[PDB]
């Protein structure tokens, strides 16, 4: 005999425990491991890959028209092209991204991001943009004069056609006491500096694409279930 | 210059390829020859650029998809072998070049989607044989924003992909390994990759009718096939 | 709504591991069966496409290699509670599946049967990696057969098997309704080729259709 | 019917071992007995010729040396369930077998009796190698005696014994039907002289007759 | 005291587990181990022994007439003598073999096989056969011209009276989604090349016997119960 | 905690088992062993007498 006694917590099924269990088929050799390309060991390898932002911010745009900003010769240079609120959890240009979707499986999320803006006009099309970054708790710019007084970059798309824009330390989480968000983690606003200058054979209406990825220091914890899906025909196919 | 076998592609802009998932194609290893009897190595008949038909990239286009090896099951020495063998193992070397002037604009997304199980829009019936096996002529994305399977186009850059922005580059090259759970698989029954060329920014020019052609050249790499002849004693 | 903010102080990447991201004992099956007089037992084909929470989470990856850890929680309700004995027989591919409570397949000596009571801690078996590929094809861009009926997206290699659960007892006077909850925890998880997460709601469990 | 194919990738011969081929806890006996007022207990002569699944599997070999691992699963049904105590007495060759529930052989101190409740995990004993040859003669080309009655195919040495199972309790008001399921797992298995597998269906359990 | 707690899976009877259990009779010495010839340690030693194929393929043949192909001087040389579909699980020339019966106790089965064809005519009887092998997914030959264009062997039975025919990598398994087989793993087809040439004192109708065994690399896993038997008079002999 | 689980054959009284059991009177010294003639250690010593 070995004198034992049961503790509170004996004979309970805790769903998130890590115990060994009895194999149903021992002396069954599984199919051997074969080198399949592109293994993911860590979900932050998914987050650190670029993905297109839905930088259009309008409700009337449906489908693929969310993904681009159409700039043209009729744009009234003092106009804000797009502002990107840096809330991942809120609906906007970042909810439908890889950094957006994988961060909705986690509660607390914290790290740097990285934006890439690719201009997709003709080769001859010149002009400038002035991309900004407002830190959270700051004033989101409405004019171009307020834009050039922040952390900004003046981008001539002459031979240059993409800007990597490192965003420092976007953090946030969920709160209950929901009725609770983060109110800002920042903005990336873009203003026409000069004009869009096209030759007469090119189309006047050129377009941008915006990308976002995470950095080495982007981090996620306290895994939860993502609300992006919610509930099926022929669902009886298992039980019959 | 891209020279494989007797086929060659001569163009000036090259050398920026995309080794898909970091893995260059190779033959089936010697410590994994526990599977079916010896894979042949033709090495000159099927490792060549099978240039598909050009597709008219216009303003109202939505996208194109070709499934591999379904695009090449009727074409030439790879098509003769597939319809006579039953197992294959091959990587691919895709070269997609979109030749436009300096007055055309637009961006393609030349993506290569492994195991692209398609869905059909607004029904509960699985897509049939002729909806998925299109052959060389390929398909057209009915809903390119969701990649015809409920996913997103925005997150489709998780795959092996290249960008043809006509302002910057006209070509794209993706080098695909043998991406499958099985060591060899069945070509007439399973489409192991899916090359997909989707607009993000549509084509545009002010002049006459706007049309640019896109050329797809798919060269199989490191082809293996099981059989043809064996020493029976 | 109020709008707060807090200095998040995370350091470490071990929680986003695919071992940690997927090994959660999620409810994969929940149906009841009566017990009076597939009639009056539990039969379920082991798949992850039964609940859209774990379906979308596992359809982030193209290939997956995992041992299932099937926990069966059985609760009973009377149409007092006695002590009943249950048999939970995992039927692999190839072995024959029961059609009745008293069929001659429940006494198959080659199937993996577990006998557990209701008044015990829940039964738990570790189903090994059952595929004859090196990974479970979550997405299968192909057909099962050659033009015979048309089966798109169905891998012939992918099949786990059936989990067939009955009540071992002879017939008793009062009638019971036996709710069986199956909790699969995938473990020893290897995962290949991440995919875009699904945006549109699921229509069926057989295919990847979308309503838009 | 659809017709698929898959690249099978097996490497290893350890699953076809005769230790692995035969050590499966197969159902070897399943009969009930009433409990009211071999009447009203369970008596079974331990043999493998009770179910044709394990009979054909063990008649692949001529000689077999194995320890049985008899698991007794007892479930009760009322003609509520109390807690009953059962005695499961293995009667070897030579020891006397009971004829009643209350006979004076259930209290034999030399037999191997196990006392187990219904509300417990199932009883399990390891019956050792009981033959007085070095192996169990599965096929016996000979007779037991010298022309006395005629007993073909019956080895006198081969006998395991009887497994006799009763209910220890005194008589209670309500009547019970007690189903006893016996699960034998042979273990430490040595096997000699493989034979052709049987093609025709079995007619009897005593001999190897065939209908054709 | 030793502080313990019970896990889910405590007090269950899993039939395929490997635990020690209490001996009913300890201090009982069993009969000692004695060297009995022909021990089998592994069931693949059973499979690798030759066994006769039922190479007759007709329904009208009953009993021992399944085991042979009767060739004679009236055979119309372009005729297919026999085709052997290399499906073990399906009914045919291989279901009633040792490689056939033991592979029906297992689900997945994969490896090389080995055919031996023994000619059983008179000593003077000459002639030729052309035995073929079609790989799976190929065309099973119907003519002798299609036969000599495959992996084949031309067999003169002069002094030669047996051919060992190594078949490479016959694999297959069971499938559920049954209504699912393997559709082919190959064929071995035999055509009369020349004629059957007998002297006038020999019988004109000579016969073949075909054998099949497994090789070193034939393998089996995921054990199941064989459907070759199915259900007894005097079955009450145990319980009385 | 020590994670355990019960096996089939837990809580059974097998009559021919050899387990230790709880002494009813510990710290009770028995009467010491004294040399009594003619000890039998083995029943075959009984059988081998005429």
**Would you kindly state where each structural domain of chain C is located, as residue ranges?**
1-212
Task: Of B31, C190, E90, B68, give the one whose Cα is nearest residue D9.
Answer: B31
Which residue range is the domain that position B228 belongs to? Answer: 1-233
Joined together, the tokens standing for residue D138 give 């599965």
What residue has token string 């997927």?
Answer: C22
Give the C-alpha separation, B8 to B2, whole Å: 6
Residue pair C130/C186 in contact by the 8 Å Cβ criterion: no
Give the C-alpha separation, D117 to D139, whole Å: 38
Number of C-beta neighbours around residue A156 at 10 A: 12
Joined together, the tokens standing for residue B110 give 């030349």
> How are strands ordered across the β-sheet holding D112-117?
D42-45, D161-167, D85-92, D112-117, F13-14
Joined together, the tokens standing for residue B44 give 């000159």
Task: Of E113, E116, E59, E48, give the one whose Cα is nearest residue E87.
Answer: E113
Question: Before B69, cis peptide (omega within 30)?
Answer: yes
Fold of A1-240: Jelly Rolls (2.60.120)
Q: Is D16 on the interface with C (CB under 8 A)?
A: no
Residues from chain E that touch F22, judged by Cβ atoms under 8 A, are: none
Residue pair A52/B196 in contact by the 8 Å Cβ criterion: no
- Overall domain count for chain B: 1
Does the structural domain C1-212 have CATH classification 2.60.120.20?
Answer: yes
C-alpha separations of E184 from C95, C167, E135, E136, E172 in Å: 22, 41, 8, 5, 9
> Do B152 and A36 make contact, defined as CB atoms within 8 angstroms?
no
Residue pair D14/E192 in contact by the 8 Å Cβ criterion: no
Note which residues in 80-139 of chain B have CB less than 8 A from chain C: 114-129, 132
Q: Is A30 left (phi over 0), alpha (psi -120 to 50) or beta?
A: beta
Residue C211, C-beta contacts closer than 8 angstroms, at least 6 positions apart: B121, B122, C200, C201, C203
From F27's Cα to the closest Cα of chain A, the distance in A is 19
Q: What is the DSSP string of E205-221?
A: -EEEEEEEEE-TT-EEE
Q: Is C172 on the interface with D (CB under 8 A)?
A: yes
Note which residues in 17-76 of chain E have CB less than 8 A from chain D: 18, 20-25, 28, 30-34, 36-46
Tell me what percent of chain F is helix, strand and coil, each rounded to the nearest 5: 10, 10, 80
Three-class SS state of E105: helix
C-alpha separations of A178 from A107, A173, A182, D9, D206 in Å: 13, 12, 12, 52, 75
Which stretch of DSSP H or E encloses residue E130?
Answer: strand E126-133
Longest dimension (CA), chain E: 96
Three-class SS state of E47: helix
Per-domain boundaries in chain E: 1-240
Residue E224, beta-bridge partner list: none
Residue pair C78/D80 in contact by the 8 Å Cβ criterion: no
Number of C-beta neighbours around residue A120 at 10 A: 25
Residue A173, beta-bridge partner list: none
Residue E116, beta-bridge partner list: E164, E211
From D179's Cα to the closest Cα of chain B, the distance in A is 47
Task: Of B232, B229, B227, B230, give the one whose Cα is nearest residue B85.
Answer: B227
Residue E152, C-beta contacts closer than 8 angstroms, at least 6 positions apart: E130, E131, E132, E133
Longest dimension (CA), chain A: 96
Number of C-beta neighbours around residue E19 at 10 A: 12
Residue E133, beta-bridge partner list: E151
* Closest residue of chain E to D92, computed from CA coordinates: E25
Subunits with at least 3 CB pairs below 8 A relative to chain B?
A, C, D, E
Residue pair D176/D35 in contact by the 8 Å Cβ criterion: yes
Longest dimension (CA), chain D: 64
Give the C-alpha separation, B108 to B197, whole Å: 6
List the CATH number of the domain containing B3.
Answer: 2.60.120.20
Give the C-alpha separation, D43 to E25, whole Å: 19
Residue pair E131/E102 in contact by the 8 Å Cβ criterion: no
Residue pair E88/E172 in contact by the 8 Å Cβ criterion: yes
The number of angstroms, rounded, from the C-alpha of D85 to the middle of its chain's C-alpha atoms is: 22
Number of C-beta neighbours around residue A228 at 10 A: 16
CA angle E87, E90, E95 (to 5 degrees): 85
Strand pairing class (E106-119; E219-223): antiparallel
C-alpha separations of A59 from A63, A79, A91, A208, B144 in Å: 11, 18, 12, 18, 20
Residue C126, beta-bridge partner list: A23, C69
What residue has token string 């001569």?
Answer: B10
Give the C-alpha separation, B227 to E211, whole Å: 24
Note which residues in 147-206 of chain E have CB less than 8 A from chain B: 151, 153, 163-169, 171
Q: Is D23 on the interface with F (CB under 8 A)?
A: no
Compare CB distances from A28 to D11, D15, D17 and report the shortest one's residue: D15
Q: Is D115 on the interface with F (CB under 8 A)?
A: yes
Phi then psi dihedrals of residue C54, to 5 deg: -75, -20
Which stretch of DSSP H or E encloses residue C33?
Answer: strand C26-35
C-alpha separations of A237 from B128, C38, C45, D206, E61 in Å: 19, 13, 8, 45, 43
The number of angstroms, rounded, from the C-alpha of C35 to the middle of its chain's C-alpha atoms is: 23
Give the C-alpha separation, D162 to D46, whole Å: 6
Number of C-beta neighbours around residue E147 at 10 A: 22
Longest dimension (CA), chain C: 64
Which of C8, C27, C29, C119 would best serve as a mutation to test chain A binding (most A beta carbons within 10 A)? C8
Instruction: Let me know if chains F and B touch, i.e. at least 3 Cβ pairs under 8 angstroms.
Output: no
Joined together, the tokens standing for residue A111 give 């790290």
CA angle A193, A97, C206 (to 5 degrees): 145
Give the C-alpha separation, D103 to D41, whole Å: 11
Give the C-alpha separation, A32 to B31, whole Å: 11
Task: Of B209, B26, B196, give the one whose Cα is nearest residue B111.
Answer: B196
Strand pairing class (A151-156; C123-127): unpaired
Task: Of E165, E168, E173, E223, give the one whose Cα is nearest residue E43.
Answer: E223
Joined together, the tokens standing for residue B24 give 């260059």
Give the C-alpha separation, B176 to B181, whole Å: 15
* CB burial of residue F41 (10 Å; 0-12, 13-18, 19+): exposed
Query: How far from each other are the two terminal CA atoms of chain B, in whole angstroms?
Result: 47
* CB burial of residue A140 (10 Å; 0-12, 13-18, 19+): middle
Task: Of C125, C126, C138, C124, give the one whose Cα is nearest residue C188.
Answer: C126
Subunits with at least 3 CB pairs below 8 A relative to chain C?
A, B, D, E
| Chain A with chain C: Cβ pairs closer than 8 A | 192
> Do D6 and C170 make contact, defined as CB atoms within 8 angstroms?
no
Task: Of E78, E53, E86, E83, give the one whose Cα is nearest residue E68.
Answer: E53
Residues from chain E that touch A11, judged by Cβ atoms under 8 A, are: 5-6, 8, 10
- HEC per residue, chain A: CCCEEECCCCCCCCCCCCCCCEECCCCCCCCCCCCCCCEECECHHHHCCCEECCCCCCCCCCHHHHHEEEECCCCCCCCEEEEEECCCCCCCCCCCCHHHHHHHHEEEEEEEEEEEEEECCCCCCEEEEEEEEECCCCCCCCCHHHHCCCEEEEEECCCCCEEEEEEEEEEECCCCCCCEECCCCCEEEEEEEEEEECCCCECCCEEEEEEEEECCCCEEEEECCCCCCCCCECHHHCCC
> Do F21 and A1 make contact, defined as CB atoms within 8 angstroms?
yes
Give the C-alpha separation, E102 to E115, whole Å: 17
Number of H-type helices and E-type strands within chain F: 1, 2
Give the CB-side neighbour count of residue B214, counting CA atoms within 13 A.
Answer: 28
Compare CB distances from B34 to D5, D6, D11 and report the shortest one's residue: D11
Give the C-alpha separation, B20 to B25, whole Å: 9
Record the resolution, in angstroms.
Answer: 3.2
Three-class SS state of C151: coil
Say which DSSP state C105 is in: T
Joined together, the tokens standing for residue A226 give 């993502």
> Do B233 and E138 make contact, defined as CB atoms within 8 angstroms?
no
Give the CB-side neighbour count of residue E38, counting CA atoms within 13 A.
Answer: 9
The number of angstroms, rounded, from the C-alpha of E50 to the middle of its chain's C-alpha atoms is: 9
From F10's Cα to the closest Cα of chain A, the distance in A is 12
Q: Is A2 on the interface with E (CB under 8 A)?
A: yes
- HEC per residue, chain B: CEEECCEEECCCCCCCEEEHHHCCCCCCCHHHCCCCCCEECCCCCCCCCEECCCEEECCCCCCEEEEECHHHCCCHHHHHHHCCCCCEEEEEEEEEEECCCCCCEEEEEEEECCCCCCCCECCCCCCCHHHHCCHHHCEECCCCCCCCCCCCCCCHHHCCEEEEECCCCCEEEEEECCCCCCCCECCCCECCEEEEEEEEEEEEECCCCCCEEEEEEEEEEEEEEECCCCCCC
Subunits with at least 3 CB pairs below 8 A relative to chain D?
A, B, C, E, F
Strand pairing class (C123-127; A22-23): parallel
* Closest residue of chain A to B164, computed from CA coordinates: A120
Compare CB distances from D114 to F6, F7, F13 and report the shortest one's residue: F13
Residue pair A130/A71 in contact by the 8 Å Cβ criterion: no
Strands (E), E42-125: 51-52, 68-71, 80-85, 106-119
* Burial track D115-127 (b if 16+ CB lie within 10 A, e otherwise): bbbbebbbbbbbb
The number of angstroms, rounded, from the C-alpha of E124 to the middle of its chain's C-alpha atoms is: 31
Q: Is the C-alpha dihedral spanning E188, E190, E193, E194 positive or negative?
A: positive
Give the C-alpha separation, A181 to A174, whole Å: 7
Note which residues in 140-169 of chain C have CB less than 8 A from chain A: none
- HEC per residue, chain D: CEECCCCCCCCCCHHHEHHHHHCCCEEEEEEEEEECCCCCCEEEECCCCCCHHHHHHHCCEEEEEEEEEEEEEEEEEECCCCCCEEEEEEEECCCCCCCCCCCCCCCCCCCEEEEEECCCCCEEEEECCCCCCCCEECCCCCECCCCCCCCECCCCCCCCEEEEEEECCCCCCCCEEEEEEEEECCEEEEEEEECCCCCCCECECCCCCECC
Residue D8, C-beta contacts closer than 8 angstroms, at least 6 positions apart: B35, C132, E108, E109, E110, E171, E172, E173
Give the C-alpha separation, A182 to A164, whole Å: 25
Give the C-alpha separation, E208 to E161, whole Å: 10
Number of H-type helices and E-type strands within chain E: 3, 15
Three-class SS state of C137: strand
Residue pair E84/E92 in contact by the 8 Å Cβ criterion: yes
Note which residues in 9-28 of chain D have CB less than 8 A from chain B: 9-11
Give the C-alpha separation, B90 to B233, whole Å: 30
From C208's Cα to the closest Cα of chain A, the distance in A is 11
Strand pairing class (D61-78; D187-194): antiparallel
> Do B191 and C141 make contact, defined as CB atoms within 8 angstroms?
yes
Give the C-alpha separation, C165 to C161, whole Å: 13
Say which DSSP state C202 is in: B
Which stretch of DSSP H or E encloses residue C113?
Answer: strand C112-117
* Closest residue of chain E to D13, computed from CA coordinates: E219
> How are strands ordered across the β-sheet holding C161-167?
C42-45, C161-167, C85-92, C112-117, E13-14
* CB burial of residue E195 (10 Å; 0-12, 13-18, 19+): middle
Q: Is F14 on the interface with E (CB under 8 A)?
A: yes
Number of C-beta neighbours around residue D19 at 10 A: 18
Residue pair E117/E128 in contact by the 8 Å Cβ criterion: no
């Amino acid at each position: 005999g070995v004198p034992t006694y049961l503790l509170p917590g004996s004979g309970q099924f805790l769903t998130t425990d890590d115990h060994s269990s009895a194999p149903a088929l021992p002396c069954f050799n599984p199919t051997p491991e074969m080198h399949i390309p592109g293994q993911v060991r860590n979900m932050l390898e998914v987050v650190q890959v670029e993905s297109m932002m839905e930088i259009n911010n309008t409700e009337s745009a449906v489908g693929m028209e969310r993904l681009k900003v159409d700039i043209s010769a009729l744009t009234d240079v003092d106009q804000l092209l797009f502002n990107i609120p840096l809330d991942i959890q809120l609906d906007g240009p970042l909810r439908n991204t890889l950094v957006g979707n994988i961060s909705r499986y986690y509660t607390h999320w914290s790290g740097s991001l990285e934006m890439t803006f690719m201009f997709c006009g003709s080769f001859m099309a010149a002009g400038k943009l002035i991309l900004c970054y407002t830190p959270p708790g700051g004033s989101c710019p409405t004019t171009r004069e307020t834009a050039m007084l922040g952390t900004h970059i003046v981008w001539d798309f002459g031979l240059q056609s993409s800007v990597t824009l490192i965003i420092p330390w976007i953090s946030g989480s969920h709160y209950r006491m929901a009725k609770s968000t983060n109110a800002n983690v920042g903005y990336v606003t873009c203003f026409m500096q000069t004009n869009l200058i096209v030759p007469s054979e090119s189309s006047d209406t050129c377009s941008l694409i915006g990308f976002i990825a995470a950095k080495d220091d982007f981090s996620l914890r306290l895994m939860r279930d993502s609300p992006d899906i919610g509930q099926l025909h022929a669902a009886e196919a298992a039980y019959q | 210059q891209l020279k494989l076998g007797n086929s060659a592609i001569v163009t000036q802009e090259a050398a920026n390829y995309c080794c898909a998932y970091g893995e260059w194609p190779n033959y089936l290893p010697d410590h994994e020859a526990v599977a079916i009897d010896k894979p042949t190595q033709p090495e000159t008949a099927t490792d060549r650029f099978y240039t598909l038909k050009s597709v008219k990239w216009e303003t109202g286009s939505t996208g194109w998809w070709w499934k591999l090896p379904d695009a090449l099951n009727n074409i030439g020495m790879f098509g003769q072998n597939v319809q006579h063998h039953y197992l294959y193992r091959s990587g691919f070397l895709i070269h997609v070049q979109c030749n436009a002037t300096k007055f055309h604009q637009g961006a393609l997304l030349v993506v290569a989607i492994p195991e692209h199980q398609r869905g059909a829009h607004n029904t509960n019936t699985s897509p049939g044989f002729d909806d998925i096996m299109k052959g060389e002529e390929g398909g057209t994305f009915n809903h390119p924003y969701v990649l015809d399977d409920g996913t997103s186009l925005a997150c489709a850059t998780i795959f092996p992909h290249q960008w043809i922005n006509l302002r910057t580059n006209n070509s794209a090259t993706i080098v695909l390994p043998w991406m499958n759970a099985a060591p060899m698989d069945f070509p007439l029954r399973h489409n192991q990759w899916t090359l997909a060329i989707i607009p993000v920014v549509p084509l545009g020019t002010r002049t006459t009718s706007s049309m640019v052609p896109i050329t797809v050249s798919i060269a199989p790499m490191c082809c293996e096939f099981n059989g043809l002849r064996h020493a029976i004693t | 709504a109020i709008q707060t903010r807090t200095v998040i102080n995370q350091h470490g990447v071990s929680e986003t591991l695919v071992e940690n991201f997927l090994s959660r004992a999620a409810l994969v099956s929940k149906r009841s069966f009566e017990y009076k007089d597939d009639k009056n037992f539990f039969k379920w084909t082991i798949n992850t496409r039964s609940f859209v929470q774990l379906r979308r989470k596992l359809e982030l990856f193209t290939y997956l290699r995992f041992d299932a850890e099937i926990t069966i929680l059985t609760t009973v309700a009377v149409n007092g509670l006695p002590d009943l004995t249950l048999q939970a027989m995992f039927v692999p591919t190839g072995a024959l599946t029961p059609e009745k409570q008293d069929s001659f397949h429940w006494q198959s000596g080659s199937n993996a049967s577990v006998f557990f009571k209701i008044s015990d801690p829940p039964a738990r078996i570790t189903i090994p990696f059952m595929c004859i590929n090196s990974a479970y094809s979550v997405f299968y861009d192909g057909f099962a057969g050659f033009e015979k009926n048309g089966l798109y997206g169905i891998n012939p290699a992918d099949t786990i098997g059936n989990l067939c659960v009955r009540i071992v007892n002879e017939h008793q006077p009062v009638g019971f309704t036996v709710t069986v909850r199956v909790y699969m925890k995938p473990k020893h998880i290897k995962a290949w080729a991440p995919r875009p997460p699904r945006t549109l709601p699921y229509m069926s469990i057989a295919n990847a259709n979308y309503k838009g």
